[PDB]
Design an enzyme around this catalytic site. Structure first.
Site, PDB file in Angstrom:
ATOM      1  N   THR B   1      47.761  48.107  39.071  1.00 27.11           N
ATOM      2  CA  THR B   1      47.335  46.891  39.823  1.00 27.11           C
ATOM      3  C   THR B   1      46.534  45.963  38.919  1.00 27.11           C
ATOM      4  O   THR B   1      45.558  46.385  38.299  1.00 27.11           O
ATOM      5  CB  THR B   1      46.475  47.249  41.054  1.00 27.11           C
ATOM      6  OG1 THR B   1      47.240  48.050  41.967  1.00 27.11           O
ATOM      7  CG2 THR B   1      45.983  45.982  41.771  1.00 27.11           C
ATOM      8  N   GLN B   2      46.959  44.704  38.848  1.00 24.51           N
ATOM      9  CA  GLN B   2      46.231  43.677  38.114  1.00 24.51           C
ATOM     10  C   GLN B   2      46.174  42.399  38.947  1.00 24.51           C
ATOM     11  O   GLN B   2      46.514  42.396  40.133  1.00 24.51           O
ATOM     12  CB  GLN B   2      46.887  43.374  36.753  1.00 24.51           C
ATOM     13  CG  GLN B   2      47.874  44.407  36.227  1.00 24.51           C
ATOM     14  CD  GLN B   2      49.265  44.223  36.806  1.00 24.51           C
ATOM     15  OE1 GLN B   2      49.425  44.062  38.018  1.00 24.51           O
ATOM     16  NE2 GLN B   2      50.279  44.230  35.942  1.00 24.51           N
TER      17      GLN B   2
END
Ligand SMILES: [Mg+2]
Ligand SMILES: [Mg+2]
Lengths: 222, 233, 240, 212, 231, 204, 244, 235, 195
Positions: B1-2
């Site tokens: 996740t970014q």
């Protein structure tokens, strides 16, 4: 935060006849209030006289159908080109779904075909693999709009024979393929009127002993 | 996740009688800052395919390298690398679609929306979409981000269904795409005037147009607009 | 890890390491098992080359696997401990998961399986041990006696012997044991077990160990004096 | 959901409703909440549908492997403990299970084990699990005797599901009856609650509050 | 002699005896023929039985809708290599929506067999394979040796007495290559080719095994009364 | 919730003239509930004494651990461990659990057998050594002990005078702490004799 | 490959013997003699250091007698380095047991553990066995005073009196001749030293060639004391018993 | 010494060829397939009269529709049987159906060549796998340690195999009844056995579509032996 | 589960444990025995999270039974309690800790003394004349503090235990459906079937 799931809308409908089975689904694909495609096939011929649709999140839907088609191919390799019976396919799909029990395929899967006695068969799955043979099953966005109508018009629920006044039920007479297709079309026409995610086109796959046949019908595009 | 950092906006595209057109502006935004003005977001693969990418630019550059590596790998032990066993649009797309879905399934997505435009060996038009979720779909017109909301409506007036594709010429299709890019410049706050356009035709091949500009803009009517209601001067 | 295939086939179809493990059993002290009508008796030889031994603490030849099953052996003493430990762990594991103690056949099948595994695993040699496993199944009054060997084969026996001079005591048992009428009492069964060992043992002093197992977890080891009384009675009848 | 099972003179009665809901939406009225583990063993479905389905057909596979290896029918105690030990390994992962493992063997007689996704394993004479369990318990407790006939026991299980089906919003559809004997279970039919309610109302004189 | 104890040892003349011994297992195996035209590719295999009560060992394996092979030598090794091909064909279809090129299939088999010839502990594969297929560049026929050598051919044969069929195909080269759009005549040429490798025994109904792939023909195997037509 | 104050209790250590003293209360509780009045918190390995406050399961575990380690130390070294060395062992052992620590407040006390020098040391839960000349305090009434010790303590006290100082420091500190008390023990340690005294105190 | 150079340390001979165990026992037969004698009121451990030198620092030296815990000690015969590996493992097992059950490890349980470790090296791993034989002298509250021995095979047995190392045949005969069940520690001390004095390969038995130890309940009241004898104390007991 | 997976100059695996010699030393096992069922029979061969012969288990159930007979180092067969049972049950779990006899046999034979320097040597036991499925009906397979399996109408393995196979060559025809097959196994077992054939030193079994796999009682087999003796004395 | 009590008298240890098993809204059982015999003279009662309680108790039982067979010897109550404590102390820093509190009542045959050990889920062991877990001590300890004597008979211990249970039944909101009482002494373990 990243959300790995999405909702591509769509609505599917499986009905099991006496010696046939139909699996229908609209061809509209959406995100939120936008249309992605007016014609994106959702119901697939998986071989061995089995048709399948995995409605909901289209990425998981495509992944599952792809893996099941693959499972049919390897079933032939491993077991001397034996035909995968609809009941065996159903159990196989349970394990595919339950394999991702803790990160599920966000889809409502329905398959249709004929059982080993040649009778019409429909199987219905939840996202995590619980399944069950059924006579009638709508899935997806407008499922709540369609199922009550099918309870009434296919199974003749709440319908009694005139004169008797609630004492004698309407008899459960068998429906022909032409009769079923009428109910499928009217189900989707009604769903199109009252559900925003339903429309554009209706694609029906009909399964018989002779094979798989396709029928397409226009739906309202608004 | 970014989270996406440097981003590219709409990619728009459509089919016409002999092929496909795809377009995207040359901007790499950094939030509300219009940071990079010379970013090419249409990446050709061979002479039959153009991949248009929106979203995170660092992930775009990674994808750009994967496609470059794909061409190299296809040429290995392949005497027909420039003929029968050349890369098709359908091969390139399926590869990307696989990668996008795998990456979302590891909870580490390539933060992009991609449109693969091209022409197949048999002359068939190829136009299909894929994004960070691994969701895929095809249509006579395809667009990402703001393009989906503003470009598609305009492009769908030209090709509203499959039967309208043979009736649509390359001049009409290009005109609609160029007009759509102007509309996006009026209305998308993360867009630029400079854009690139690519045409993949089954007869004339790949035509890649750089340094195009939005022109014939209407602004003169702004002089008459005064205040926000009651003000006359 | 050490992966060398020690147990392998020879041109004549023999696995010499398994066969040489049997030669280690042949060297081991004699062990005998006799099942009566309502009991099983396990007799064991103690070589009298070792005196000044402390018999209180010296490892006994017969070992309890559970309260209802026992295991005796012939062959390498150190090897037997590994099989005994594994068996005892599996006995408790079976009680824990199945909520019922092991059958004698099950426990035998497990030990035999362990022995077999060591005949086709890399980097290991077979156990130089043959076992006699005896007892009574839970809530059952039928006597059980099984035998295992290094190869991993196992089988049930009315009576059986293993170890050095086991050929001689098997000869004795084959003519003296009647299947239609086995030793009806504990006395008769113990007597026949002591008699069979007296064909081989030498002196009937501290060289014979006897363990009697009865139904419902009733296991007891006979003392020197108790066994000595059998030895006395046998030879006094023989003087005729 | 409403599922029950109770021991009696003639073996075990298993009775379940048929309704499945997703929120207020009635997804199905024809769900099978009795898993036929094998011809001798039955399991009930409550909590997670798939968790019960998947792991109890798996349990049937484990029972089959047991009797192939041991040449003997698996005990209800052993069968239930295979399932409980399995779900206990998954504890915390989010399995949802409330089931009665029911069987009739020589050594045990008729036996019922309540098995739980928290790892609980309880032997007992009467069990009731689901959203309508409290309604079924009332009818059971007040009418249960060990010396019930197979006919009366079957009716008691049917009537107790009906009680729950009426009051509990998430229970209904139809009633499935099973009778477990030493020689195996016997299916005693599917009974629509709609038709059953009026039938029972008239014949029994119960449900006077309801107009029919 | 002293240099045949394992696959990791070259002989003084630069030979790998374990590979050569694996090659010998193919010569002991039953004869199988491969040939192709521009439209179709055909496998013909003489199946071997243990005795009169036994079945005839299957020689042909399907790898995909457009590809498959026939075996000669250790059948379990063919099962391992065919399984590997099935996966590689399948990887290409799933990931790239692309049918695996027959030439590339040969490259993969070569590399898999090679690793078994250069490392200690393992052994070479004890089987030879004849891979036929129809891909984007038309019909193809490959010959696989467990040394790693894969060769693209118009026709060939492997197994016991395979030299007779191989010489026949070398004469008939100009004829059978031209058999386009006629599957029956191409099979006839294959059945006539494999007949040159027969001694004492002849082609019976449960003895013969034929497979074919082509332009509008999925890889299909013919056994039993389906090959009585060609006897 | 706070692991260091679930069970409660205190330890104090002091130096004197040719002697050291270490003392502790006897309470073990479950927050408000008193569970045991015999839970001693001082242990010894040879002539080295270790007090441990904090979570009671860790007090027990660490005692068993240092018994383990000092026993092996003695077998290999062929001599009893000294206070200075043991202090470093306690520090090393606590810090190896840096990101999953024992919730304790150890206190070392003893006299070096060779030099005859009195020695005390304290630690935080993670291993940091506090080597004070005067006194070391630990537990749920550490603030109270700091106040008592700071005012009552003077250097070079004789063993029988030091006993009175440390006893009064502990008792009055514990009487101002809900989670301490229920009895007390005081060790008076000289180079070759150790006296252990149980104190009489209020039992609430 | 590597197979060529493998001695195969864990295989049977045609006769059913373990080659390496037998050869390790041959190695141990050349080691200094160690004797253990169990009495009613204690145990004696006596052992001969191998051909020493006058420049060897005896008072700080330890090659034969080792302490496992406060209740159990061992006499070593064979490779000293191999013994120390096993001794440290045994010391750890004793402490693990004490930590777990809060009770001192029973003698047999410790002996079985070490013997099982030795066994493992004969059945798997492809390593050479430990060329060591132990005499275990220990006490616990179940069986009281106990003497055991273990050898490279991993087999262990209990004894009233026993020898390991060199001249065990001669030593065991001499012990079997003069040992009695009602014997006391002071008598056992004399028997041990007399046995070594006769079986030794040296010209005369002196204090500098010996290690000596006793496990006595001769500790103040119900408890056990281990006494590893000092060079001067071994010299005194040699004069007392009348050997020098 | 030499590699375990080494090829001989003739192109055969030494260890596989040597394991076949161990199987030749094993007790005889015979299988005969008919359209009414498949019959499996074995020589028990007890090493002593004190050995309780009913504990000799050389015929084994894999599933309800598949049985198995063994010959050679019978201890090696236990893990093969375990795998077979697991494979049969696992397939039923995944596909809600019976597994094909060939597919089961193929699964067992996949273990065979998993040896090297995986297990340290090949299996020293051959298996006769008999069963029934809906696709190919009654089937009999011979599973070797080479990894190869042949289907047979009739097959004998063990010490008296070549003599028994020659006898099966003459006697077998496509119209054999189940009763005719039972007597034929008993006839050929009696011929090749060292000791005299009776119900205690020989065992019969069969697999039918209706009743599935069944090991025959000693009382049932004793009647078939008596029926055999009379019909041989009849001419 | 809910209430578990323990009291060590002159020549025996008495453990009392509630019979109720509640799963949410309903009382599923009113005859549950929350105890396991670890050895002939050692009994362990337990209370805590569902599943973990029985899983832990049976795991300990199996380990002590294994030790008993291996050594042909019964471990002392002190030794058993130390083993149990270590397992719980090991458990508290695990991925998913056992949420189980126990009382170990045993008769030491060597010392001829009854012994009661209280151990919570953290591995906090204490030897006591009387003990409890959870809220049970809050209601009962004032009575035990008052009446308890170390020279009590088994019959007197049972009477004091009845008074404790009566106070629980009066002031506790939950219905724990009475208690099963067991006595551990030199002759072994036996259940008081009327209480
Ligand atoms: Mg609509
Ligand atoms: Mg207070």
């Amino acid at each position: 935060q990243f959300n790995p799931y999405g909702d591509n809308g769509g609505t599917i409908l499986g009905i099991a006849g006496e010696d046939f089975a139909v699996l229908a689904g609209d061809t509209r694909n959406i995100t939120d209030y936008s249309i992605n495609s007016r014609y994106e096939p959702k119901v697939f011929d998986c071989g061995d006289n089995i048709v399948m649709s995995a409605n909901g999140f289209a990425a998981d839907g495509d992944a599952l159908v792809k893996r099941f088609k693959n499972s049919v191919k390897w079933y032939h390799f491993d077991h001397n080109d034996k035909k995968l019976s609809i009941n065996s396919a159903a159990r196989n799909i349970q394990h595919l779904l339950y394999g991702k029990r803790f990160f599920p395929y966000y889809v409502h899967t329905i398959i249709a075909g004929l059982d080993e006695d040649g009778k019409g068969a429909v199987y219905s799955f939840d996202p995590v693999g619980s399944y069950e043979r059924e006579q009638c099953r709508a899935g997806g966005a407008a499922a709540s709009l369609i199922m009550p109508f099918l309870d009434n018009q296919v199974n003749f629920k709440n319908q009694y024979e005139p004169g008797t006044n609630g004492k004698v039920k309407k008899p459960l007479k068998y429906l022909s393929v032409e009769e079923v297709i009428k109910l499928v079309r009217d189900s989707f026409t009604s769903a199109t009127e009252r559900h925003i995610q339903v429309g554009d086109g209706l694609e029906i796959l009909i399964v018989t002993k002779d094979g798989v046949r396709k029928e397409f019908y226009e739906l309202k595009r608004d | 996740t970014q989270q996406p950092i440097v981003t590219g906006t709409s990619v728009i595209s459509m089919k016409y009688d002999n092929g496909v057109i795809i377009a995207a502006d040359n901007l790499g935004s950094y939030g509300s800052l219009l940071r990079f003005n010379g970013v090419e977001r249409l990446i050709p693969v061979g002479d039959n395919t153009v991949v248009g990418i929106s979203g995170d630019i660092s992930d775009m550059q990674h994808i750009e390298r994967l496609l470059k590596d794909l061409v190299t790998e296809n040429a290995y032990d392949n005497p027909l690398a420039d003929a029968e066993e050349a890369l098709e649009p359908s091969y390139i797309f399926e590869y990307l679609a696989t990668v996008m879905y795998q990456r979302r399934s590891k909870m580490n997505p390539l933060w992009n929306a991609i449109i693969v435009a091209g022409v197949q060996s048999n002359g068939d038009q190829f136009l299909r979409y894929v994004n960070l979720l691994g969701v895929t779909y095809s249509s006579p017109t395809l667009a990402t981000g703001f393009g989906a909301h503003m470009a598609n409506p305009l492009l769908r007036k030209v090709v509203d269904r499959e039967s309208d594709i043979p009736k649509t010429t390359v001049q009409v299709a290009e005109e609609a795409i160029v007009n759509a890019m102007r509309v996006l410049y009026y209305r998308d706050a993360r867009s630029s005037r400079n854009f690139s356009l690519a045409i993949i035709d089954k007869n004339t091949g790949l035509t890649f147009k750089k340094n195009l500009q939005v022109e014939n803009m209407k602004w003169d009517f702004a002089k008459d607009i005064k205040g926000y209601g009651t003000q006359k001067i | 890890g050490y992966d060398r295939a020690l147990s392998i086939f020879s041109p004549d179809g023999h696995i010499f390491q398994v066969e040489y493990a049997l030669e280690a059993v042949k060297r081991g002290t004699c062990a005998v098992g006799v099942k009566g009508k309502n009991c099983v008796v396990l007799g064991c030889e103690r070589r009298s080359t070792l005196k000044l031994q402390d018999t209180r603490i010296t490892p006994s030849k017969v070992s309890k696997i559970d309260s209802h099953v026992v295991l005796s052996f012939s062959g390498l003493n150190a090897d037997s401990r590994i099989l005994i430990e594994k068996a005892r762990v599996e006995a408790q594991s079976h009680r824990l998961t199945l909520e019922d103690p092991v059958t004698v056949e099950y426990l035998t099948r497990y030990v035999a399986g362990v022995q077999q595994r060591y005949t086709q695993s890399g980097g290991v040699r077979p156990f130089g041990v043959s076992t006699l496993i005896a007892g009574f199944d839970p809530r059952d009054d039928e006597p059980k006696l099984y035998q295992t060997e290094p190869s991993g084969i196992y089988s049930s026996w009315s009576a059986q012997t293993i170890g050095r001079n086991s050929k001689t005591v098997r000869e004795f048992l084959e003519k003296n044991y009647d299947r239609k009428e086995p030793p009806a009492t504990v006395e008769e069964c113990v007597k026949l077990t002591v008699r069979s060992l007296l064909e081989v043992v030498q002196t009937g002093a501290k060289n014979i160990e006897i363990t009697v197992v009865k139904p419902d977890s009733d296991i007891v080891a006979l003392s020197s004096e108790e066994i000595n009384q059998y030895v006395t009675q046998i030879e006094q009848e023989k003087q005729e | 959901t409403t599922t029950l099972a109770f021991r009696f003179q003639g073996g075990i009665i298993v009775a379940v409703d048929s309704r499945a809901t997703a929120g207020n939406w009635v997804a199905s009225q024809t769900v099978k909440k009795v898993i036929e583990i094998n011809p001798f063993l039955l399991g009930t479905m409550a909590g997670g549908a798939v968790d019960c389905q998947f792991w109890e057909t798996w349990l049937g596979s484990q029972c089959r492997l047991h009797e192939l290896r041991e040449k003997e029918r698996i005990s209800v105690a052993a069968a239930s403990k295979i399932l409980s030990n399995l779900v206990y390994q998954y504890k915390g992962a989010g399995l949802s299970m409330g089931t009665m493992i029911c069987g009739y063997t020589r050594k045990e007689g008729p036996t019922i084990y309540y098995v739980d996704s928290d790892g609980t394993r309880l032997k007992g004479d009467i069990f009731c699990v689901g959203s309508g369990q409290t309604f079924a318990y009332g009818v059971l407790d007040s009418n249960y005797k060990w010396d019930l006939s197979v006919e009366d026991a079957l009716y008691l299980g049917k009537r107790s599901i009906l009680a729950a089906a009426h009051r509990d919003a998430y229970s209904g559809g139809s009633v499935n009856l099973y009778h477990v004997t030493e020689d195996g279970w016997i299916y005693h039919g599917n009974h629509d609650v709609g038709e059953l309610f009026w039938k029972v109302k008239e014949e029994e004189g119960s449900f006077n509050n309801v107009i029919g | 002699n002293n240099y045949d104890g394992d696959t990791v040892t070259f002989s003084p003349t630069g030979r790998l005896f374990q590979v050569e011994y694996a090659l010998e297992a193919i010569k002991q195996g039953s004869v199988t023929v491969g040939l192709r035209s521009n439209t179709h590719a055909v496998l013909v295999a003489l199946k071997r039985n243990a005795d009169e009560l036994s079945s005839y060992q299957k020689k042909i394996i399907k790898c995909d809708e457009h590809m498959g092979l026939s075996l000669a030598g250790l059948a379990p090794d063919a099962r391992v290599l065919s399984n590997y091909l099935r996966q590689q064909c399948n990887y290409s279809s799933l990931v790239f929506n692309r049918k695996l090129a027959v030439e590339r299939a040969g490259h993969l088999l070569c590399d898999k067999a090679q690793k078994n010839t250069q490392s200690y502990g393992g052994r070479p594969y004890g089987v030879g394979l004849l891979i036929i297929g129809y891909d984007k560049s038309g019909a193809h026929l490959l010959e696989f040796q467990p040394s790693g050598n894969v060769t693209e051919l118009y026709g060939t044969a492997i197994g016991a007495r395979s030299q007779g069929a191989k010489t026949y195909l070398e004469r008939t080269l100009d004829t059978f290559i031209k058999i386009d759009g006629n599957p029956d005549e191409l099979i006839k040429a294959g059945v006539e080719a494999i007949s040159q490798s027969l001694r004492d025994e002849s082609l019976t109904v449960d003895n013969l095994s034929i497979a074919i792939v082509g332009k509008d023909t999925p890889f299909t195997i013919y056994d039993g009364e389906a090959v009585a037509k060609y006897i | 919730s706070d692991p260091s104050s679930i069970n409660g209790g205190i330890v104090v250590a002091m130096t004197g003239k040719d002697c050291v003293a270490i003392a502790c209360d006897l309470r073990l509780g479950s927050q408000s509930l008193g569970v045991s009045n015999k839970f001693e918190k001082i242990f010894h390995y040879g002539h080295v004494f270790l007090g441990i406050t904090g979570l009671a399961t860790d007090v027990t575990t660490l005692n068993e651990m240092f018994r383990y380690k000092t026993n092996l130390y003695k077998l290999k070294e062929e001599r009893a461990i000294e206070p200075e060395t043991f202090t470093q062992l306690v520090s090393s052992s606590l810090y190896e659990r840096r990101f999953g620590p024992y919730f304790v407040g150890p206190v070392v006390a003893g006299i070096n057998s060779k030099s005859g020098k009195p020695f005390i040391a304290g630690f935080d839960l993670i291993g940091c050594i506090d080597e004070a000349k005067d006194f070391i305090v630990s537990g749920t009434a550490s603030d109270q002990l700091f106040g008592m010790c700071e005012s009552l303590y003077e250097p070079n006290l004789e063993p029988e005078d030091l006993f009175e100082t440390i006893s009064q420091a502990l008792l009055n500190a514990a009487d101002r702490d809900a989670l301490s008390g229920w009895g007390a023990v005081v060790y008076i340690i000289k180079k070759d004799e150790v006296v252990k005294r149980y104190l009489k105190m209020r039992q609430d | 490959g590597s197979r060529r150079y493998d001695s195969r340390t864990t295989i049977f001979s045609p006769e059913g013997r373990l080659y390496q165990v037998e050869y390790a026992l041959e190695s141990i037969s050349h080691a200094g003699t160690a004797i253990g004698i169990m009495a009613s009121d204690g145990i004696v451990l006596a052992a001969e250091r191998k051909v020493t030198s006058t420049l060897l620092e005896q008072d700080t030296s330890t090659e034969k007698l080792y302490k496992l815990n406060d209740k159990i000690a061992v006499a070593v015969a064979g490779l000293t380095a191999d013994a120390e590996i096993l001794i440290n493992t045994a010391r750890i097992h004793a402490q693990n047991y004490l930590k777990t059950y809060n009770e001192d490890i029973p003698v047999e349980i410790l002996v079985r553990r070490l013997s099982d470790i030795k066994q493992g090296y004969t059945q798997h791993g492809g390593l050479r066995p430990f060329g060591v034989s132990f005499i275990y002298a220990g006490y616990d509250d179940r069986y009281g005073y106990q003497l055991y021995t273990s050898n490279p095979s991993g087999n262990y047995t209990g004894w009233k009196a026993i020898s390991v190392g060199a001249n065990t045949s001669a030593a065991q005969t001499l012990l079997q001749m003069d040992y009695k069940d009602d014997m006391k520690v002071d008598d056992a001390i004399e028997l041990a030293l007399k046995t070594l004095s006769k079986t030794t390969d040296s010209s005369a038995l002196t204090y500098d060639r010996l290690e000596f130890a006793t496990i006595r309940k001769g500790a103040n009241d119900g408890e056990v004391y281990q006494k590893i004898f000092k060079p001067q104390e071994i010299k005194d007991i040699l004069v007392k018993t009348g050997i020098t | 010494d030499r590699g375990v997976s080494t090829f001989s100059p003739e192109g055969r695996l030494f260890q596989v060829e040597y394991s076949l010699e161990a199987i030749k030393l094993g007790s005889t096992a015979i299988g005969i397939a008919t359209k009414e069922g498949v019959v499996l029979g074995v020589e028990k061969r007890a090493t002593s009269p004190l050995l309780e012969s009913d504990s000799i288990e050389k015929i084994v159930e894999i599933d309800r529709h598949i049985g198995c007979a063994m010959s050679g180092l019978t201890a090696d067969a236990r893990s093969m049987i375990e795998h077979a049972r697991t494979a049969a049950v696992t397939h039923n779990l995944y596909y809600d159906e019976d597994i094909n006899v060939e597919s089961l046999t193929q699964s067992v034979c996949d273990l065979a060549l998993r040896f090297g320097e995986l297990m340290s040597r090949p299996f020293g036991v051959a298996l006769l796998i008999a069963g029934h499925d809906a696709d190919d009906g009654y089937q009999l397979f011979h599973a070797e340690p080479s990894g190869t399996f042949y289907r047979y109408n009739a097959k004998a393995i063990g010490s008296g195999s070549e003599g028994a196979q020659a006898e099966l060559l003459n006697e077998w025809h496509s119209s054999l009844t189940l009763k005719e097959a039972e007597l034929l196994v008993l006839k050929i077992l009696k011929q090749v056995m060292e000791e005299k054939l009776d119900e205690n030193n020989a065992q019969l079994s069969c697999i039918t579509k209706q009743d599935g796999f069944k090991i025959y009682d000693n009382e049932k087999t004793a009647e078939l032996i008596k029926e055999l003796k009379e019909k041989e004395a009849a001419e | 589960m809910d209430i578990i009590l323990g009291i060590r008298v002159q020549d025996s240890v008495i453990l009392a444990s509630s019979k109720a098993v509640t799963r949410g809204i309903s009382v599923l059982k009113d005859s549950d025995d929350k105890t396991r015999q670890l050895s002939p003279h050692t009994l362990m009662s337990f209370a805590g999270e569902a599943g973990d309680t029985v899983q832990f108790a049976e795991y300990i039982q199996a380990n002590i039974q294994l030790y008993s067979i291996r050594e042909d010897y019964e471990l002392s109550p002190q030794a058993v309690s130390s083993f149990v404590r270590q397992e719980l102390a090991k458990s508290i820093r695990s991925r998913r800790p056992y949420q189980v509190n126990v009382l170990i009542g045993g008769y030491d045959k060597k010392k001829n003394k009854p012994e009661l050990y209280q151990i919570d889920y953290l591995g906090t062991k204490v030897e006591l004349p009387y003990g409890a877990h959870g809220y049970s001590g809050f209601y009962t300890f004032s009575l035990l503090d008052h009446h308890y004597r170390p020279d009590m008979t088994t019959e007197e211990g049972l009477d004091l235990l009845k008074l404790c249970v009566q106070e629980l039944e009066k002031r506790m909101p939950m219905d724990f459906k009475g208690v099963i009482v067991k006595i551990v002494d030199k002759d072994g373990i036996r259940q008081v079937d009327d209480f």
